[PDB]
Structures are given as C-alpha cells and as structure tokens.
C-alpha cells in the first residue's frame, strides 16, 4: 500500500502548521455527540491530499533552495480539517502547545510563550478560517490561508494575523460594481446564496453598489438545494420577484449548488433571459453548465482569478505516488490525518483528478510567504543567518504585514489589511452550442477595462440589455419611490386635470372645471 502518513511531517527547524481537508467527514455521525471527541475522518478527499502535497512541495523547494532561510529548514505539520471545526480545532491547540510538551498553558499574556510552530497555513474553509482566526488572534500566530475569501477576515480588528491569499470577495465585488457602473446598469437586482457566503457577498455589494450609484431592485437570497420543497417554492418566489422587478442584470453571488438549483428551476419554468454577473464560484463550473436547455438564459459574464499556474505539480504528485511505493524508501523515512492503512491506500487513479488546480499555487504562495517572513524577521542574508534566538510568531506578525514575496516570479505583496493584490479577468460564457466556453473580455485591476466588442448579449442585434433607474428625472413628472434602497424613483406623468400641487407629492391632484390642465401639469391653469 502507498505510504504517506509517515511523510506528512518533517522535523526541520521552524515547523509550519497545516490544516487541509485531506479527508472529508461522512454525514452520518456528526449529529450524535454523547462523548467529547471529534468524529473520525476515514474517508478520502483527493483535492485535500493534492493540497497537502502542494504544501510539501513548497517546503521542499525552499529547503533545497539556498537563498531562502540559509542553514535553516521548515517542518511540515499537516493535519486534517474535514471542513468541520470540531475535528479541525484540536490540531490548532496542538499548534500552540509547547516545544515538545503536549500541554497548552492558559497564561494571561503570550510574550513568554514559545509555540511549537510559527505560521499556521490556514484552513481552506472560510468558516474554519473564522474559527482558527479567532483562536490565533489571541496568540498572534501568523495564519496565511489559501481558501478564505469572506471579507470579514480583513482588518486588524479581531483577526490581527490572517495574511491570506485568494483575494477576498471585496475585490471581485468592487469589480462587478464597476462592471455595472460602466455598462450603465443601476437598476440591478443583486442575488446571493442563502448560506453565509452569499450573505456576506450581498452585504458587501449593497454597500459597494450604493457607493457606485447603482441601487438594488431586489436584494434576495436563493436557498442551497439540500431538500428543497419549501426552498423550491422560495426559489420560485425569488425569481418571480426578480422578473417582476423588470431588470436585466442579476448579480448572483451564490455558491455553485445554489446556482445549480436556481438555473434548474428557471429552465424548468422557462424564465426570461437576463444577464448574470457571476462569481468565481460558478463562472467556471460543470454543475451549472451541464443542465440541458440552459443556454437560453441571457449572457453570463463574471470575474475570474488570474492566478499564475504552478506547473510541475502533477509531476510532483506522480513522483510521490511512485516513490512512496518503494518499501525501503519510507521505511527509512519512518525510522497526522489519513494515517490508517486504508487511508494511505490510495493510488494514482484515485487522486489523478484535480492536479492542475488553481489553489495548489495558493498553498505554495502561503508557504513561501511565511518563508520570506522568517527570512526578514531572522535577518538572514545569502548563505547565512545569525539565528541567535528562537523566533516567536508575533515577530513574524510584525514583519509579515506589508511583506512582498517573490513566488513563481509574481511579486505578491500583503496589503495592510492582510489580503493580497491580484488582478482578475472578465470571463464570458459564449455559446457555440451545448458548451459555454470562457474567454477574456475585460481585465480588472481596480479599474475595470472591458472590451465591449466581445459580448454576444443574446436578445436581437446583440444590443446590450439596458437596465436603468431614472434618478432625478424631469420636473414634468411626479416621483414614485422604487427600490430596496430608495435611491432613484420611477417617473409618472400627470394626467388631465390632475395638477401636481407640489413637486414632492405621490400623485397629481385634480381641480375643478374652472381651470384647464393638460397632462404633465403641476398647476391648474384657467
């Protein structure tokens, strides 16, 4: 059987934590809890192990490299998360126990603490991001993550050390608000998923869109499917109100499954076409793509992450799969999750699915960010380092903010909040027939530049779907407030006789026959 549990850890000198979803928890025994413990994760999640091998490759690359951390090594501390805090937190406690000792003290302060690891490569889950961030905020442990995207983990408010990769939803939502602004769309009916991801996205977009002058028509949430029934009725109601608001853009900041449910129902009821400014979660997704008859749903165009491919990762995974098979190799290595014989009894076929994924580079980048953070805090130069004293994590915290580290030739730098600065791209779902290929229409760098000549726009004569709110319209009309935020109103022309008594009423008031008053007349004139 393949032998990987032994190699999920190396002694090195400055150990780095790892919280990855190598195995995902079965949905059977989570509910029943009559014994304090975390349910085992005997199942295998291929993408999680791909990520673990990504972290291992990162650490091996720095260790082999001379310039970074000369005369110094970093050790792995891979642990499982199963995307569940209960089975992903006690590893976090392990990460602050002690140098060797397994007990974690509860001191008032943390300066005298000398923790086991330096920086914990944060969890993929954003909920796990919240839990681990709240944990490591007190201890001031650097936690560079690789999946977190919720904007809540931005400021040094409750997460002082969360220098994540994978730029937050704030940047793509600014990009989408800019898209709506230049494309003239302001009567947008934004939508999001019923889970926390869509909730935070839609709050962010409410603020952002109001700032940009584009005001919502229906801020609604689409339930994730699970067992829909009443949630199917809720989906029906949500799309009904979207249609009855008479818009053409629905920015859908919903997870992949909520989008699948929404599109499934819409096609099942032949809902009207419209533009769907998409998230990175379903701009590139097979689930929504594979629904038959989906193509006639407007034009779908969103923003994608421009993360440079980290090649040679499939080569590295293949090399490790082949190499762990030799009995002599890892027997000497032996002389962490997914440790049972069946847990390590994987094969190339079982893991040869993700490979060229865009998050193995995220894990690479996190590891290299902590590597360069140490290099800065330990005052090492080429082929040397004074290394007088052990480094506490808060020293990294001091020297991790505003740190620029060269990864794959990309000079990623951590912003003051903690995020990273990377550009996006406007992927457009053009249809050649049953396969919506994606290609560049516009690149976002904080100032969205779109090629307007590269969008089909469905409809007829490819005219851009116009969705406009008449803000501050003529004096010859009466104003009716419309919109989830009272921004902008709908203009209604006064009828015969009905003289608008004042320019700030809800209707035009009728007068006697003594005066003659045509339409759009405020004062009855004799």
């Amino acid at each position: 059987p393949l032998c990987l549990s032994q190699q999920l850890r190396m002694k090195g000198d400055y150990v780095l934590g790892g919280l990855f979803p190598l195995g995902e928890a079965e949905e059977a025994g989570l509910r029943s809890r009559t014994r304090p413990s975390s349910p085992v994760c005997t199942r295998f999640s291929s993408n999680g192990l791909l990520w673990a091998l990504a972290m291992k490759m990162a650490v091996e690359e720095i260790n082999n490299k001379s310039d970074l951390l000369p005369g110094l090594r970093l050790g792995y501390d891979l642990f499982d998360t199963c995307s569940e805090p209960v089975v992903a937190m006690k590893p976090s406690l392990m990460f602050l126990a002690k140098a060797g000792s397994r007990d974690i003290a509860a001191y008032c302060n943390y300066t005298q603490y000398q923790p086991r690891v330096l920086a914990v490569i944060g969890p993929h889950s954003s909920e796990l991001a919240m839990v681990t961030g709240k944990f490591f905020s007190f201890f001031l442990m650097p936690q560079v993550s690789y999946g977190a995207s919720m904007e809540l983990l931005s400021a040094r408010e409750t997460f002082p050390s969360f220098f994540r990769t994978v730029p937050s939803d704030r940047v793509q939502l600014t990009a989408a608000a800019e898209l709506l602004q230049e494309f003239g769309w302001n009567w947008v009916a934004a939508l999001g998923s019923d889970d926390e991801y869509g909730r935070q996205g839609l709050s962010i977009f409410s603020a952002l869109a109001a700032a940009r002058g584009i005001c919502i028509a229906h801020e609604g949430l689409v339930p994730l499917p699970r067992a829909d029934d009443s949630r199917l009725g809720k989906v029906q109601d949500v799309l009904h109100q979207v249609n009855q608001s008479s818009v053409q853009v629905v920015l859908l900041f919903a997870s992949v499954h909520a989008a699948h449910a929404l599109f499934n129902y819409s096609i099942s009821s032949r809902l009207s076409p419209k533009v769907w400014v998409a998230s990175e979660a379903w701009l590139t997704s097979d689930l929504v793509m594979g629904l038959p008859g989906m193509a006639q749903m407007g034009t779908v165009l969103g923003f994608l992450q421009r993360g440079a491919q980290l090649h040679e990762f499939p080569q590295y995974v293949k090399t490790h799969l082949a190499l762990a098979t030799d009995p002599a190799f890892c027997s000497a290595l032996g002389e962490v999750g997914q440790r049972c014989p069946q847990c390590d009894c994987i094969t190339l076929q079982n893991v040869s699915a993700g490979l060229n994924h865009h998050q193995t580079f995220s894990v690479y980048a996190a590891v290299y960010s902590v590597a360069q953070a140490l290099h800065n805090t330990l005052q090492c130069n080429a082929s040397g380092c004074p290394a007088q004293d052990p480094v506490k994590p808060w020293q990294l915290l001091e020297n991790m903010y505003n740190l620029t580290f060269h990864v794959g030739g990309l000079p990623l730098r951590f912003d003051s909040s903690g995020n990273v600065d990377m550009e996006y791209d406007l992927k457009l779902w053009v249809w050649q027939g049953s396969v919506p290929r994606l290609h560049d229409v516009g690149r976002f760098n904080g100032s969205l530049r779109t090629e307007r000549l590269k969008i089909r726009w469905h409809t007829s004569d490819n005219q851009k779907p116009v969705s406009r709110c008449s803000r501050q319209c003529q004096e010859g009309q009466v104003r009716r407030v419309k919109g989830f935020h009272s921004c902008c109103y709908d203009c209604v022309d006064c009828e015969a006789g009905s003289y608008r008594q004042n320019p700030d009423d809800i209707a035009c008031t009728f007068c006697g026959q003594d005066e003659w008053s045509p339409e759009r007349s405020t004062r009855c004139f004799r």
């Binding site: 413990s37 937190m89 709240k134 905020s137 608001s245 935020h485 009272s486 809800i506 209707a507």
Partner: protein, 500 residues
C-alpha cells in the same frame, strides 16, 4: 464579586465594557447581569434543598464585548496550574469549571461554542439571539435561555399586524446582529403581507468618535429618505452604542412622526434616554424579555488569576444608574438567573442529592450536558426547560418608552408567548399623534367598493384605485385586482360594484 471557590465551579463571560478590560468604555448592563448570576448562586447556596454542600463557585472573566472571547475559555477547562493537556479523547478530563455560563454577544458566544465543542462543556448564554445558534450539530454545548431572533421578529411582525402597519421601514446595522435580523424580518414580512419600504445600513459609529465627512453625508441621506417615505414605522436593528449618532441628526432633522420598533439590543438600553428630547421623534417601542425581578435582588444590587478579569468604575456607575435600573426593573437578569439555575439543577440531580446529602462523585462537562438538556422546574413561577434546539421559552415583551423620570422608563405593553406564537395583552399604548390615535402607515388607502385595486410598483401593499368602466362591476367575490363585466341582463356603471 469576581471569585468564589467550591467543589464544582462555574464560569461567567460577562461584558463589563465596550467600545485589561478597563481601557474600554464601561458598560453597566454587564455588571447588572453579573450581579444577577451572583444572586443566582448565592441563593442556590442558601437554599440547602438545591445543593447541600458541593457549593458552586463563579469565576468571572470580562469578555470586553467581542475582543476577549477566546482567552477566558482557554483559562477555563484548564487545570489549576494554567495548563491544558490535549488528548484525542476528552471523556476523562477533570475540568475545574464545569459549565461556562453567559457569553453575551452572539459573536463571542459562537467563538466560545466553537472552542468548547471539543470538550462538550455546557455553555448557557443569556442574551445570544442569532438564529444560527439553534443548530445543535455545530454547537452541541450551546444551551440558551432566551428566545431566538425568529421569536423577536415574529413578535414585532404580529405587533404590526395588530396595529395594521402594512408599510414599514427597516434600518439595519453593519454587523451580524443587523444584517441577519433584518433578513429575518424581511423574510417574515414577505409572508404576512407587511411590505418593506426601503432598507438602509446604519453606519457603524462610536459614541467617542467625532464623526467623519462621508459618513455624515450618508446619514443625512438616510434621514432625508426617512422624512420622504410615507412609511412611518422604522424598525432599527443595531447595537446600542451605534444608534446614538444616527438618532442625533434624526432629531435635528425635525423628523417628527414615527414609530420606532426597537430591536432587543436597544429596546431596554437606558443610554439613549439621556437625549431627553426623544419625545419629538415619536413613540419608541422595543422588544425584550420581561420577568418579575428577583425577590431579593435589591440587597445584592445596592450592597457596598486571569487577564482583563476585573473592572474599575463599574460599581459607581451601576449605583448611579441604579435609579433607572431599579425603576426599569432589569429583566434580562432573569435570563442569566435561569441559566444558573438550570446548570445548578443539572449538577444537583447528576450528584443525586435527594434532599439529604450529596455524593461528590466525579463529574465531567459532557455528563452535565447530557443531564442539562432536560430540566423541568419552576423558578419564580416559570417552567424552565429547553426545546430540542437548546432554547428555553421565556416570554418576549414589547416596551414603550415613557420619558417621565418618575418611574418605569420602560412600560410592558405587549406580551408574546413563545410556544403559542401569539401576541396578547396589548396595554393601551400612548402615541405621538394629535388624538392618541394609532399612527397609520400604509402605502395607499384601501380601495373603495366599485374601484379596482390595480397593483402599482414592486410590492403588493401599493395599489391605486381605478373605477372600472360602465358595464363593469368590481367582482370582489373572485378577484379584486381586476374588474370584470357583469354578464346577463345586469349592466353596471362607473363604480357601483353591485351590478344591476
């Protein structure tokens, strides 16, 4: 009052400040709730029936609202030597604190519950409201003793149904308590024919802050919308220390007529009262949990090892505001009172003290959870018991704001029954109107007979009354949004629903 030893200890995560913990702005309600827990365990000791011997001993650590939420738990469930061993199986763990009790904020509650799910050590919160806490797969050890956000939302919506407010404004905050609660209100009113006019996020500001420029313009815009929209019921969801600024220029804008349904956060907070000119803003209403005061609470209220676990000026401030706190009859104290009594009864029955003696058999936090998930006792004429989703049924209440300094700065207007899910005993409530009449808040007046109520705009609460043409009668029996022609020899005219 911050430490007491005992055979079995318990811990209180009270929020003595907001905005060491002394550096933050002093908050009176934290000290009030702490004194509530104090009286709880003190009477438990005095009442030899509840627990002979094996006295409980509180261990309070100020949580500083949302700041200090993690270190107090770490101190908890750790041996006396401030050292917490880590094992895969926590079944055999002697924890000094047997059940932490009373993290206040929902975010702090969630942080504590996430930290505790490893140990299955009970956490009973006295003020957490977030609906997410009802799911007992992420927080198995998060019993709660106050109705969830869903129940406050139902109480408010049924209040507006009773007073016939089908056109309402809701302003939310920029935190979870704002967004989640406003969402719950919107989803609820969607199905009860109450229509939201517009929603505006009240900017997050501090009482000590001197405001900014963009934020000032934003709030000016908000109040302009408030004075524009015909909807005159404003339901504001926000922590207490956030309203102050917004209410300031709401007042200054001469915005007179309104009905502010106040969220549970600031439905009982006496800080906004000192504005002393809120009468001009209109009848202020709020939702809370009202209970008879603890019989002896006056004695403890007026009587003379961990980081940031002590306050400095809390006692003097509490005694100063004692006028309001006594006159208001603090009621959220009974939430923490009932939490303490639930833990006490679970611990008592687990030791099996049959009114004679206690066997001090080793106890573990998870055993206390198993025993605490089922309690049925009468505490001050109230049945305390948790529903499967870990939330007891305490009566939410509606409070109108009486400015008179004499007594009762909060008046118990409407009683809401959690289990019954109904609203009753709506005491005659004073209004800002010219004849004490109920302030109407409707998008448009209900259409008269013979006039069709054609919908206009987004919401179903807005309609303009066309008088359908001669030969057509308002077929109110079947459809009202459209007028149809009366068939047969009957031939109607303008209006005149009764087709001849």
């Amino acid at each position: 009052d911050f430490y007491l030893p005992g055979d079995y200890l318990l811990g209180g995560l009270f929020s003595l400040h907001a905005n060491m913990c002394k550096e933050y702005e002093v908050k009176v309600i934290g000290y009030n709730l702490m004194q509530a827990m104090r009286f709880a365990v003190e009477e438990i000791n005095n009442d030899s029936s509840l627990l002979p011997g094996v006295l409980l001993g509180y261990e309070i650590v100020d949580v500083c609202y949302i700041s200090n939420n993690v270190q107090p738990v770490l101190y908890f469930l750790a041996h006396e030597d401030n050292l917490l061993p880590i094992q895969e199986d926590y079944s055999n763990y002697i924890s000094r604190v047997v059940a932490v009790i009373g993290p206040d904020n929902s975010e702090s509650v969630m942080t504590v519950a996430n930290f505790l799910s490893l140990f299955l050590l009970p956490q009973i919160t006295y003020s957490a409201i977030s609906d997410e806490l009802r799911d007992k797969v992420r927080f198995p050890a998060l019993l709660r003793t106050t109705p969830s956000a869903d129940h406050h939302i139902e109480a408010m919506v049924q209040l507006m149904l009773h007073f016939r407010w089908n056109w309402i404004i809701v302003l939310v905050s920029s935190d979870t308590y704002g967004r989640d609660n406003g969402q719950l209100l919107g989803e609820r009113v969607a199905r009860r024919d109450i229509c939201i006019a517009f929603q505006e996020t009240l900017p997050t500001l501090q009482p000590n802050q001197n405001m900014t420029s963009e934020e000032r313009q934003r709030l000016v815009t908000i109040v302009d919308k408030l004075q524009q929209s015909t909807a005159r019921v404003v339901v504001v969801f926000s922590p207490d220390l956030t309203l102050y600024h917004f209410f300031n220029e709401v007042l200054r804008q001469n915005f007179t007529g309104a009905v502010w349904i106040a969220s549970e956060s600031w439905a009982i907070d006496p800080v906004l009262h000192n504005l002393t000119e809120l009468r001009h803003l209109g009848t202020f209403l709020g939702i809370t949990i009202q209970s008879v005061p603890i019989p002896g609470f006056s004695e403890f209220r007026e009587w003379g090892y961990t980081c940031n676990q002590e306050c400095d000026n809390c006692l003097n401030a509490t005694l100063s505001f004692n006028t309001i706190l006594r006159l208001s009859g603090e009621r959220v104290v009974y939430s923490v009172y009932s939490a303490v009594y639930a833990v006490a009864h679970a611990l008592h029955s687990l030791l099996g003290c049959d009114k004679s003696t206690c066997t001090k058999r080793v106890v573990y936090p998870w055993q206390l959870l198993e025993e605490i998930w089922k309690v049925n006792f009468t505490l001050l004429d109230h049945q305390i018991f948790f529903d499967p989703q870990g939330d007891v049924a305490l009566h939410l209440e509606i409070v109108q704001w009486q400015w008179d300094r004499s007594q009762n700065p909060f008046q118990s207007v409407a009683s809401y029954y959690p289990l019954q899910r109904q609203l009753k005993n709506i005491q005659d409530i004073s209004w800002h109107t010219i004849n004490n009449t109920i302030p109407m808040s409707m998008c448009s007046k209900r259409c008269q007979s013979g006039q069709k109520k054609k919908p206009v705009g987004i919401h179903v609460c807005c309609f303009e009354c066309i008088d359908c043409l001669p030969g057509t009668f308002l077929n109110h029996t079947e459809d009202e949004y459209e007028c149809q022609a009366c068939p047969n020899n009957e031939w109607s005219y303008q209006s005149e629903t009764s087709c001849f």
